Scaffold this active site. Structure first.
Site, short mmCIF file in Angstrom:
data_model
loop_
_atom_site.label_atom_id
_atom_site.label_comp_id
_atom_site.label_asym_id
_atom_site.label_seq_id
_atom_site.Cartn_x
_atom_site.Cartn_y
_atom_site.Cartn_z
N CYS A 154 90.82 23.81 84.17
CA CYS A 154 89.77 24.83 84.23
C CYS A 154 88.54 24.36 84.99
CB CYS A 154 89.39 25.28 82.81
SG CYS A 154 90.79 26.10 81.92
N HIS A 183 96.24 26.77 79.38
CA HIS A 183 96.02 26.27 78.03
C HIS A 183 97.36 25.99 77.34
CE1 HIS A 183 92.05 28.83 77.99
NE2 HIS A 183 92.00 27.82 78.84
#
Ligand SMILES: [Mg+2]
Ligand SMILES: [Zn+2]
Lengths: 246, 389
Positions: free
Chosen positions: A94, A189
């Site tokens: 991210c 994730h």
């Protein structure tokens, strides 16, 4: 005993669930190959060199944490770039991925400066790209996880693969993440590595080759990982048939 | 006018009030009385105002019921006491969440000179202020250093003279051993906890008897003692109370205990790393081997991101005596993989159906530790209730 050192950058954040699971996954896949993993947490970067580094890792934080982490990482921007250009394996998650680029634009138009390691940028909106993601890669086989990000990243480099369900870097490309030499970057994730052992093994095998130690046995038991991947593949497939039947 | 005639037919009416602990106190009293086949009137946490109390007396009065056990909102005490005079009233505590002072005064005026036996928490100065309202006072409380509570910090005023209240010892916040130069003080207690622990359930030393309970929570020690005091004052002896206290359990799936012959289980909701670490550490305070059933749904109310399980300390399970771990819910496979990565080397069984997974624990002689996240709780608790009937 054979050993690999992991440079864990900027582990001083409010939360690091993604960080810890990725480290666990690397430690355990290496242990199965009789390799001990040494994790060095680096929060002060002044005078840091990459001579003792085998793999580096940069997770994601809040926009504040990311801007702080980027200001500290810029004190070693040039060795990091040279390391990456030399083939140093690395995993970035991210904000750690986005801020390798030139800039990050917030929804309210504020331009945040990245490291400029690579020439790309990221533009975030308020509507997020969110849901299950299934990617098909030639290097990493089938990659599976969860995405939930406002940022749209626009780069012209290789990626982790084609997205058969979900979004990836942005609304249009159907490609996820970045794969530049041995540097990987992603929005996924899970965290990404526990289920996606081909990515874990990629980073460890490139590190072993670069150091001149064996990576053996190459083929081990992946059953638990496969069963965990299959839940999301099946759910993704159920979700597609529902749209086609709409 | 009808509540009055119903209440007159009941020899003993116990009211339970205070700002906290009313329901557990009430339930402990009612459970212990019913376990001795005593017929009672008993309301519930959704019915502790005037209207609900009146309804409880109408619905439940029979010619045999000779005790009422009534929890009552503290604000409802004046309206209700225009119709019913309890024979005894136990007060747990008053917490502000000078507003406590006024409300306590109104309660004192309401119950004064009515002959009501008051059971007051000596350790709470605002509860103890109610000593002015009756000539029949029974004090309960906890000895200094009975337990080291989690701890939290201001100066409070003596309800009798307006000085700052001096404390000799603090249990927590306003609860402690206080003593004012005007005479107002933490009085000597007829029923006292000298010591207790939670490991993982409440274990209490009350007047030199041990009470091995099946509920948890440090705060619940005072509720248990409040209930104990009522029951002694109704004449029950220590062994009869011990029988009831040893079998009372919660009903919300938080540290809830189950037992059928030699098979035991407990369920504790966990939906984040701190809650999971706490639930996993319960097993190690439990004697003998364990069987786990752990459920991880990823429905909207759970959140879709299961990554937090990698911040939970599943590795600690290697330090426990565990027969098997059953993993369940829609992301049961994420749990299998987390346990693989935790190097927890015990039989792991994937059973995505929460009802089937939970029933399966009945096949093991170990202590079942059942740990669901939020939308797993209702099916897992339902199956446990079914399995333990
Ligand atoms: Mg405690
Ligand atoms: Zn005073």
């Amino acid at each position: 005993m054979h050993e690999l050192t992991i440079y864990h950058f900027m582990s001083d954040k409010l939360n690091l669930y993604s960080d810890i699971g990725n480290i666990i996954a690397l430690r355990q896949r290496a242990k199965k190959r009789n390799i001990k993993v040494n994790v060095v947490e680096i929060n002060e970067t002044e005078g840091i060199t990459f001579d003792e580094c085998d793999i580096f890792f940069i997770g994601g934080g809040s926009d504040r944490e990311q801007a702080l982490a980027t200001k500290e990482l810029s004190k070693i921007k040039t060795p990091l770039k040279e390391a990456i250009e030399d083939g140093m394996p690395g995993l970035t998650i991210c904000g750690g991925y986005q801020f390798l680029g030139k800039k990050y634009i917030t929804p309210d138009g504020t331009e945040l400066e990245g490291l400029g390691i690579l020439d790309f940028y990221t533009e975030s909106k308020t509507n997020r790209l969110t849901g299950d993601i299934v990617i098909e890669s030639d290097t990493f086989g089938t990659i599976v996880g969860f995405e939930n990000h406002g940022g749209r990243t626009y780069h012209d480099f290789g990626t982790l693969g084609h997205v058969t369900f979900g979004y990836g870097n942005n609304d249009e490309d159907k490609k996820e993440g970045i794969h530049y030499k041995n540097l990987l970057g992603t929005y996924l994730h899970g965290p990404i590595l526990p289920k996606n052992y081909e990515i874990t093994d990629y980073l460890l095998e490139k590190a072993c080759e670069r150091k001149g130690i064996p990576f053996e046995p190459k083929e081990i038991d992946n059953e638990a990982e496969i069963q965990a991947k299959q839940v999301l593949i099946d759910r993704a497939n159920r979700q597609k048939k529902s749209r086609l039947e709409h | 006018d009808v509540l009055r005639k119903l209440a007159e037919q009941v020899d003993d009416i116990v009211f339970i009030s205070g700002t906290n602990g009313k329901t557990t106190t009430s339930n402990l009293i009612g459970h212990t009385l019913k376990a001795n086949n005593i017929q009672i009137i008993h309301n519930n946490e959704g019915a502790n105002m005037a209207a609900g109390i009146t309804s409880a007396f109408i619905m439940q009065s029979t010619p045999k019921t000779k005790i009422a056990v009534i929890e009552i909102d503290e604000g409802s005490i004046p309206r209700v006491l225009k119709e019913v005079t309890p024979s005894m009233m136990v007060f747990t505590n008053f917490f502000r969440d000078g507003e406590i002072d006024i409300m306590v005064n109104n309660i004192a005026e309401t119950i004064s000179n009515k002959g009501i036996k008051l059971l007051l928490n000596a350790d709470d100065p605002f509860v103890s202020r109610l000593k002015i309202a009756s000539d029949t006072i029974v004090y309960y409380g906890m000895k200094a250093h009975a337990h080291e509570f989690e701890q939290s910090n201001e100066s409070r005023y003596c309800p009798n003279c307006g000085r700052l209240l001096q404390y000799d010892y603090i249990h927590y916040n306003q609860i402690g051993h206080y003593h004012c130069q005007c005479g107002f003080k933490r009085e000597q207690a007829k029923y006292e906890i000298s010591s207790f622990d939670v490991a993982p359930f409440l274990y209490l030393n009350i007047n030199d008897e041990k009470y091995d309970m099946k509920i948890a929570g440090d705060f619940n020690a005072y509720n248990a003692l409040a209930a104990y005091t009522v029951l002694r004052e109704l004449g029950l002896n220590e062994q009869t109370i011990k029988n009831g206290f040893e079998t009372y359990t919660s009903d919300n799936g938080r540290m809830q205990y189950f037992k059928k012959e030699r098979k035991e289980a407990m369920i504790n909701l966990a939906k984040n790393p701190a809650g999971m670490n706490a639930s996993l550490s319960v097993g190690e305070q439990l004697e003998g081997e364990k069987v786990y059933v752990i459920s991880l749904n990823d429905n909207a109310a759970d959140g879709r991101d299961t990554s937090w399980i990698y911040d939970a300390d599943f590795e600690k399970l290697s330090k426990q005596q565990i027969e098997a771990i059953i993993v369940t819910g829609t992301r049961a496979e994420e749990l299998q993989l987390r346990l693989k990565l935790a190097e927890v080397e015990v039989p792991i069984i994937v059973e995505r159906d929460i009802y089937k997974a939970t029933a399966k624990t009945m096949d093991y002689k170990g202590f079942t530790v059942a740990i669901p996240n939020y939308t797993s709780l209702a099916p897992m608790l339902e199956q446990l209730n079914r399995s333990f009937e």
